[PDB]
Design a protein around this ligand. Structure first.
Ligand SMILES: O[C@@H]1[C@@H](O)[C@H](O[C@@H]2CO[C@@H](O)[C@H](O)[C@H]2O)OC[C@H]1O
Ligand SMILES: O[C@@H]1[C@@H](O)[C@H](O[C@@H]2CO[C@@H](O)[C@H](O)[C@H]2O)OC[C@H]1O
Ligand code: XYS
Ligand code: XYP
Ligand code: CA
Ligand code: NA
Length: 330
C-alpha cells in the first residue's frame, strides 16, 4: 500500500532509523539503520544501539509503496567490524554503488567502511578493512555538480569524534563527551574528498568550521547550535547546506557556505525535536520537490533505540532560508 502522505511511518514490519535518501535510476533509494530490540545496556555511549545489518528501501513515488530489498549487508560478513552498524549512506559512480557505514572495529574504535554493488538495491560486498584514515560515525557522501565526491562524517559522545584531535585515538578512558572547554570553539564535523575509485580518501581529513551570523566560532557550550552527529550536505541555488543533529538538544539545524569545506554560517532549525532522544535526517530533491527524511520512536511507543523513518516536504525560500518543520503540528 502507498505510504508517506501525512508523516506516517514509511515501514512498520521492521524498525528503521537514520534515513539517507538518494535518487538513483529515477527512484528514491533509502539507506537507513535497521534497529532491533537487542536489550543491550542503555548508556550515554549508545551501547543500546546494537544494530547488525542494513536493508535498502525504495519508493517509485512519494507517497508510494515502499519496497524492502532484504539484507543488503550483514555485520557477520564485514571482516574488520565487531559490533554496531550505525547510520549509513550510499553513492553511485560509473555504474557501481557504494554503501558507506560506521561500525566498531575489534578494538572498539568506530571506523567507516565501504561495501560495493552493481545495483542501488544491493546486496553489497564489504571491503576487508575500513577506509584508511577514517574514524567516528555517520558518513554522508555528497556528489557535487562538478563530479567531485566528498565524505562528511563525525559524531561526539558515543561517536568518539572528541577522541580524534591528534590523528591517533585518545583511548577508552578519554573524554566521553567533547573537548570539555565550553568557551573554546566546538568540535566540527570532518570532510575528505573521495578517491576516484570511491574506496579511500584523496586528501588528509579536514575539520569544518561552523560560525554564527557575526563570524564567531560556535562554542562548545552552545549545545543548541553546535555539531553533535548526523552531518548531511545538499546544494541549492549555488549554496552549500551543512545540516546536522545537535544531539542533547534534539534539533536538526543547518548552516550555509559557498564551497564544500565551509566555513558554514549557522542559519536555523530544520527539524524540531521528535519522539525519542535521537534526531537524524536527509534532504533530497525528487521530481522537483525537496523532501526531509527523518525518524522518530512513535511506532515503538517511545523507545529511543526502536525507530521508524518518516518523510515530509521541505521548503526553501528563494533567499536560501529553509522553513522550520515541527514534526507533530499538521
Ligand atoms: O575494552 C572493551 C572492548 O573490548 C569492547 O569492544 C568490542 C570488542 O569486541 C569487538 O567485536 C567489538 O567491535 C568491540 O566494540 O567494548 C567494551 C570495552 O570495555
Ligand atoms: O553516540 C550517541 C550517544 O552518545 C547518544 O547517547 C544518548 C545520550 O543521552 C542519553 O540520555 C540517551 O539515552 C543516549 O541515547 O545516543 C546517540 C548516539 O549516536
Ligand atoms: O549513528 C546513529 C546516530 O546518528 C544516532 O541516530 O544514534 C545511533 C545511530 O542510529
Ligand atoms: O548568533 C550571534 C551570537 O552568537 C553572538 O553572541 O551575538 C550575535 C548573534 O547574531
Ligand atoms: Ca546520516
Ligand atoms: Na526557522
Amino acid at each position: 500500500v502507498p505510504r508517506g502522505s501525512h508523516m506516517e511511518p514509511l515501514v512498520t514490519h521492521i524498525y528503521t532509523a537514520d534515513p539517507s535518501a538518494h535518487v538513483f535510476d529515477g527512484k528514491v533509494y533509502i539507506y537507513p539503520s535497521h534497529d532491533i530490540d537487542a536489550g543491550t545496556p542503555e548508556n550515554d555511549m549508545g551501547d543500546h544501539f546494537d544494530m547488525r545489518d542494513y536493508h535498502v528501501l525504495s519508493m517509485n513515488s512519494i507517497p508510494g509503496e515502499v519496497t524492502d530489498h532484504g539484507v543488503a549487508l550483514d555485520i557477520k560478513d564485514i571482516p574488520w567490524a565487531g559490533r554496531q552498524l550505525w547510520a549509513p549512506d550510499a553513492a553511485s559512480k560509473d555504474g557501481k554503488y557504494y554503501l558507506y557505514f560506521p561500525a566498531k572495529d575489534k578494538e572498539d574504535i568506530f571506523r567507516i567502511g565501504v561495501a560495493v554493488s552493481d545495483s542501488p538495491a544491493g546486496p553489497f560486498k564489504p571491503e576487508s578493512e575500513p577506509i584508511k584514515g577514517s574514524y567516528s560515525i555517520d558518513p554522508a557522501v555528497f556528489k557535487d555538480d562538478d563530479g567531485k565526491y566528498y565524505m562528511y562524517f563525525g559524531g561526539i559522545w558515543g561517536g568518539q569524534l572528541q577522541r580524534w584531535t591528534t590523528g591517533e585515538y585518545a583511548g577508552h578512558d578519554a573524554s566521553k563527551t567533547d573537548l570539555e572547554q565550553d568557551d573554546a570553539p566546538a568540535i566540527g564535523p570532518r570532510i575528505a574528498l573521495m578517491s576516484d575509485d570511491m574506496l579511500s580518501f584523496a586528501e588528509p581529513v579536514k575539520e569544518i568550521s561552523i560560525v554564527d551570523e557575526q563570524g564567531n566560532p560556535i562554542l562548545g557550550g552552545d549545545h543548541d547550535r553546535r555539531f553533535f552527529e548526523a552531518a548531511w550536505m545538499h546544494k541549492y541555488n549555488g549554496t552549500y547546506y551543512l545540516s546536522y543533529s545537535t544531539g542533547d538538544t534534539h534539533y536538526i539545524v543547518y548552516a550555509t557556505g559557498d564551497n564544500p569545506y565551509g566555513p558554514f554560517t549557522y542559519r536555523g532549525v530544520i527539524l524540531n525535536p521528535v519522539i525519542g532522544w535521537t534526531n537524524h535526517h536527509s534532504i533530497v530533491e525528487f521530481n522537483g520537490k525537496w523532501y526531509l527524511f527523518y525518524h522518530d520512536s512513535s511506532l515503538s511507543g517511545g523507545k529511543t533505540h526502536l525507530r521508524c523513518i518518516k518523510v515530509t516536504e521541505l521548503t526553501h525560500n528563494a533567499d536560501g532560508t529553509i522553513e522550520t518543520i515541527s514534526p507533530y503540528i499538521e
